[PDB]
Amino acid sequence: MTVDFLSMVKYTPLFISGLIMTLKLTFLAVTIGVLMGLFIALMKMSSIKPIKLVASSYIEVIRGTPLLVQLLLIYNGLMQFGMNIPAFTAGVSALAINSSAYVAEIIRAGIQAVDPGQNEAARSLGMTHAMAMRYVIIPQAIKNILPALGNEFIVMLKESAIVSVIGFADLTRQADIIQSVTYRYFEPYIIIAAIYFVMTLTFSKLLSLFERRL
Amino acid sequence: MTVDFLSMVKYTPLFISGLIMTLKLTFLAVTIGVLMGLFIALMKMSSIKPIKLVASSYIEVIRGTPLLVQLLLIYNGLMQFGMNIPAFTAGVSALAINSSAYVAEIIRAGIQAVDPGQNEAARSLGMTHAMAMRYVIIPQAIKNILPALGNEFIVMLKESAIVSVIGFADLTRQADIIQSVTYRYFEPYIIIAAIYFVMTLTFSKLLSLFERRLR
Amino acid sequence: MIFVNDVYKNFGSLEVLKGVTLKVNKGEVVVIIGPSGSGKSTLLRCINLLEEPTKGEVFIDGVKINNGKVNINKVRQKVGMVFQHFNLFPHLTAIENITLAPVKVKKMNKKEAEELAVDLLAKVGLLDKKDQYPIKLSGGQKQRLAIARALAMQPEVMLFDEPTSALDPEMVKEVLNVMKQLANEGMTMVVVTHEMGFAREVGDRVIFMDDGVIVEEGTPEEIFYRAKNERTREFLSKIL
Amino acid sequence: MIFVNDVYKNFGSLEVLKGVTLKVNKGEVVVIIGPSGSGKSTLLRCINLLEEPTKGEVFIDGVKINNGKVNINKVRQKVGMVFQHFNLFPHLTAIENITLAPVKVKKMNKKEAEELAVDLLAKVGLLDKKDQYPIKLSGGQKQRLAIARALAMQPEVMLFDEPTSALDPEMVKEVLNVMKQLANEGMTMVVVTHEMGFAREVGDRVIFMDDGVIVEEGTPEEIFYRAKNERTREFLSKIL
Numbered sequence: 001m002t003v004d005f006l007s008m009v010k011y012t013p014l015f016i017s018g019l020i021m022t023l024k025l026t027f028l029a030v031t032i033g034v035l036m037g038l039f040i041a042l043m044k045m046s047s048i049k050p051i052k053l054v055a056s057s058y059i060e061v062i063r064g065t066p067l068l069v070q071l072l073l074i075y076n077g078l079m080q081f082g083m084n085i086p087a088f089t090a091g092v093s094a095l096a097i098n099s100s101a102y103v104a105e106i107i108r109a110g111i112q113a114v115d116p117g118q119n120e121a122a123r124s125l126g127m128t129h130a131m132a133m134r135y136v137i138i139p140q141a142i143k144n145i146l147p148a149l150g151n152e153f154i155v156m157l158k159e160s161a162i163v164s165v166i167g168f169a170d171l172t173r174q175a176d177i178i179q180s181v182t183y184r185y186f187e188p189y190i191i192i193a194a195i196y197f198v199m200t201l202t203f204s205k206l207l208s209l210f211e212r213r214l
Numbered sequence: 215m216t217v218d219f220l221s222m223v224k225y226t227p228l229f230i231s232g233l234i235m236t237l238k239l240t241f242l243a244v245t246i247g248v249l250m251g252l253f254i255a256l257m258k259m260s261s262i263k264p265i266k267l268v269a270s271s272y273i274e275v276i277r278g279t280p281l282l283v284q285l286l287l288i289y290n291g292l293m294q295f296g297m298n299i300p301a302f303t304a305g306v307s308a309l310a311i312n313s314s315a316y317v318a319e320i321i322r323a324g325i326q327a328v329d330p331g332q333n334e335a336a337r338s339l340g341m342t343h344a345m346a347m348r349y350v351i352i353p354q355a356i357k358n359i360l361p362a363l364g365n366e367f368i369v370m371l372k373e374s375a376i377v378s379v380i381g382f383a384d385l386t387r388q389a390d391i392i393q394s395v396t397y398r399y400f401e402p403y404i405i406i407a408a409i410y411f412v413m414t415l416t417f418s419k420l421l422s423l424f425e426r427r428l429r
Numbered sequence: 430m431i432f433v434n435d436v437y438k439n440f441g442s443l444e445v446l447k448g449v450t451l452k453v454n455k456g457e458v459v460v461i462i463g464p465s466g467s468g469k470s471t472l473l474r475c476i477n478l479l480e481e482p483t484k485g486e487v488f489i490d491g492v493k494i495n496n497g498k499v500n501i502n503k504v505r506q507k508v509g510m511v512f513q514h515f516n517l518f519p520h521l522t523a524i525e526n527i528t529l530a531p532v533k534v535k536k537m538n539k540k541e542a543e544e545l546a547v548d549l550l551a552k553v554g555l556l557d558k559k560d561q562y563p564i565k566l567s568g569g570q571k572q573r574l575a576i577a578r579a580l581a582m583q584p585e586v587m588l589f590d591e592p593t594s595a596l597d598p599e600m601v602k603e604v605l606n607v608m609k610q611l612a613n614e615g616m617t618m619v620v621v622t623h624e625m626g627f628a629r630e631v632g633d634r635v636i637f638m639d640d641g642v643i644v645e646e647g648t649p650e651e652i653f654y655r656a657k658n659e660r661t662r663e664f665l666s667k668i669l
Numbered sequence: 670m671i672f673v674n675d676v677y678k679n680f681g682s683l684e685v686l687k688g689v690t691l692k693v694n695k696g697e698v699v700v701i702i703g704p705s706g707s708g709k710s711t712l713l714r715c716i717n718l719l720e721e722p723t724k725g726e727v728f729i730d731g732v733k734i735n736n737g738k739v740n741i742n743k744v745r746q747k748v749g750m751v752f753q754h755f756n757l758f759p760h761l762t763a764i765e766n767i768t769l770a771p772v773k774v775k776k777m778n779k780k781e782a783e784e785l786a787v788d789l790l791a792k793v794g795l796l797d798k799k800d801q802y803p804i805k806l807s808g809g810q811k812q813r814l815a816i817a818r819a820l821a822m823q824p825e826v827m828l829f830d831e832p833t834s835a836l837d838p839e840m841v842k843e844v845l846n847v848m849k850q851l852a853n854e855g856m857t858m859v860v861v862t863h864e865m866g867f868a869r870e871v872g873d874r875v876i877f878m879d880d881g882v883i884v885e886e887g888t889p890e891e892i893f894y895r896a897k898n899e900r901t902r903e904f905l906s907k908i909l
């Protein structure tokens with residue numbers, strides 16, 4: 001028809017449900033993506049030439065490849081093997097995976113970021129690569145990484161709206177659900193977009209405010 | 215059943231067609247997005263408080279908001295007004311718009327990037343903000359900006375696989391199309407993903423190569 | 430000529446200039462010295478309005494230039510500035526650096542501006558380098574070239590913000606020599622420097638700043654041999 | 670003790686050391702000088718293998734350390750290094766900076782290391798600053814703290830790679846003094862510096878490098894007052 005937002009008010013429980021779904025999806029996908037990513041990083045630092053090459057290729061592949069295709073590849077691609085994984089787990093796996101590569105590059109970058117001088121001071125005082133890393137470099141690379149991570153999570157939120165297409169009851173899916181009973185697409189989107197926005201701002205507020213502390 | 219890529223071979227014309235569509239979509243969306251972003255930038259440089267405030271809010275919103283929701287908002291959201299825009303034009307618009315914000319921020323950053331010393335030398339030589347800008351500052355920001363743009367396009371390529379869900383015949387959509395006649399999803403995806411990879415590598419390589427030529 | 434009248438300056442909570450007065454008349458070579466953070470380069474920079482005083486006023490040639498009712502570009506046409514870091518234009522060649530402002534600000538004739546530049550280049554001993562780009566120049570070649578550029582807009586005063594501080598030691602003489610030559614030619618100079626040799630050799634007046642204030646001032650030999658104030662002595666003691 | 674034997678070094682196409690030999694024995698204070706790019710800090714950094722010679726060998730205490738068949742972590746225990754840019758550890762306190770390596774490399778007693786640090790802090794006059802972080806420290810304070818830290822591992826030789834050049838001039842005396850004091854106490858020192866006063870006052874031997882080579886070397890007074898080589902005199906005229 002023509003615009004009516006006031007009619008949209010009754011559907012709040014849906015949106016709130018959608019949001020809580022987007023949160024629960026991302027919080028878990030990042031959490032996994034992180035732990036996965038720390039692991040992939042360590043592989044690229046390994047002296048063993050094979051392991052570093054795999055982690056290098058793994059990282060190079062995921063980053064150079066669409067999240068969507070990674071989503072569909074797990075969900076649709078895995079069916080013909082008698083696999084029926086829920087939309088939820090597909091999205092988490094897809095995200096924790098896309099997540100993992102970028103987390104593995106943030107780690108590496110936060111280390112290379114600490115001044116090469118710090119290392120030289122440490123080695124030149126007799127400390128071994130091990131010790132230098134533990135007591136000097138790492139404690140300092142951490143302050144490099146946490147900002148880029150929290151900022152990744154913030155990105156993963158926008159990201160996660162794509163698993164809507166797999167029929168997951170996330171914030172983006174609620175527009176389909178709503179319009180089915182209202183024939184309205186516009187208003188439920190503007191609302192959802194506005195919700196994504198406020199989520200972005202807020203985390204960005206807390207992300208930069210936590211950053212100014214370090 | 216079990217993995218069989220060899221059966222996928224006959225579908226080459228489809229993939230080749232999917233790619234050429236991915237290319238046509240991204241290329242146009244960027245071409246517009248850039249010019250669009252360039253315009254948004256100038257607005258954020260306006261002395262005029264209203265114009266600067268809108269371009270800032272525009273940029274703030276598009277970046278802090280999902281591409282998907284932007285796609286759907288254009289496609290699905292516009293139906294109820296008697297609007298039926300093709301998937302193609304919808305995907306382009308969504309990209310050119312999402313693109314435009316990151317372009318307006320790439321530009322501003324490429325300018326802020328050139329040493330504040332340069333403006334000072336020029337201003338201290340009698341040159342006005344205008345002159346300083348034309349003859350000294352901008353020529354140097356360009357070498358900052360072209361790299362970040364070309365790097366944006368590469369991102370616009372991965373991005374564009376999303377217009378498949380809107381039923382656009384892009385490279386990702388080819389996996390649905392194929393499976394309708396094969397009941398295979400896995401192989402056609404691994405293929406499409408492999409194509410996306412190779413497109414990435416190729417462009418990233420030429421992007422870095424063009425960087426060393428400027429800097 | 431130049432008259433900085435009791436200016437103050439903040440950068441946020443940071444009080445850098447805490448009430449400073451500076452008069453310099455035509456022909457003077459006035460050298461400003463002091464510990465880091467004293468306010469030296471900020472004072473030096475209020476002169477051509479590269480900084481805006483939180484308070485106080487600066488008059489050059491009798492006219493207040495920080496009232497916002499005056500064309501600031503036509504002010505900097507008269508007031509030259511040499512930079513600690515050279516701040517050359519990297520995309521332009523040696524000549525191109527020099528001729529840019531005159532051709533575009535003064536609207537000089539390109540042929541005339543081209544002949545001016547080759548003169549200045551010879552003056553600062555860089556003629557053989559006229560076409561090369563700022564990056565093939567030594568730090569010493571750089572600063573001398575920067576000086577040529579500043580002069581080509583023919584100022585009545587030249588501001589020097591530590592023109593030797595980012596130079597390898599074997600490179601400081603040549604830049605200091607050029608500066609001295611100008612002093613000898615009667616150019617009005619305000620100079621902020623660590624090089625007390627310069628003040629000794631061609632300075633007319635020496636200003637000692639400390640903690641955002643001018644704590645003492647006089648002639649080179651006054652300050653360097655007979656400094657009255659304890660902070661002056663203390664500072665000089667560490668550096669001479 | 671130290672024996673850098675005919676080493677060469679490249680950085681890509683860049684030839685920095687073009688065959689250099691340097692022997693230094695217990696007690697000598699050897700100061701290396703020269704123009705930018707002469708090879709000075711690269712030589713100094715081959716000593717404890719902070720650089721690996723493209724060719725040639727370095728022995729410390731008679732044993733080759735760049736044959737890949739030696740524990741370099743046990744080498745840098747003997748050869749100390751003070752850096753131009755201080756390289757203190759930000760997240761650690763003054764004492765924490767000093768006490769770290771001894772505790773973790775030597776496995777020292779924490780109460781013992783505290784007194785070593787407090788001795789050293791006191792020695793270099795940073796006692797009131799023991800629990801400050803390497804931030805509330807002036808650049809001069811920083812380098813003295815760095816020096817205490819190196820000393821706490823009690824090396825037999827100290828490498829000084831331009832310990833003063835990133836210091837405001839009011840800050841150079843105090844650090845140079847600590848250096849003099851160490852020399853006076855008999856510490857073996859190789860020092861790369863721009864401060865010829867130090868070379869004069871405490872140098873036992875002075876090496877003049879130019880273009881990746883030792884072009885001339887002799888005592889402070891031989892080099893500063895009776896230099897035989899033309900390139901030696903030319904360099905010295907620009908700096909002195």
Ligand SMILES: Nc1ncnc2c1ncn2[C@@H]1O[C@H](COP(=O)(O)OP(=O)(O)OP(=O)(O)O)[C@@H](O)[C@H]1O
Nearest residue numbers: 440443445463464465466467468469470471472591
């Ligand atoms: N562009 C700027 N914005 C804010 N603060 C500045 C700026 N430039 C310098 N400062 C600060 O002003 C203070 C005074 O420094 P300034 O360089 O003006 O005087 P100085 O220390 O005597 O000179 P120098 O540092 O050149 O020896 C310092 O604390 C410095 O950090």
Ligand SMILES: Nc1ncnc2c1ncn2[C@@H]1O[C@H](COP(=O)(O)OP(=O)(O)OP(=O)(O)O)[C@@H](O)[C@H]1O
Nearest residue numbers: 597680683685703704705706707708709710711831
């Ligand atoms: N790729 C490189 N890596 C490290 N050092 C290099 C490289 N290329 C050139 N160098 C220079 O080789 C120099 C040999 O020292 P030298 O004293 O001659 O140079 P300098 O520019 O005066 O610097 P400094 O006086 O700080 O040593 C080193 O100081 C260093 O700056």
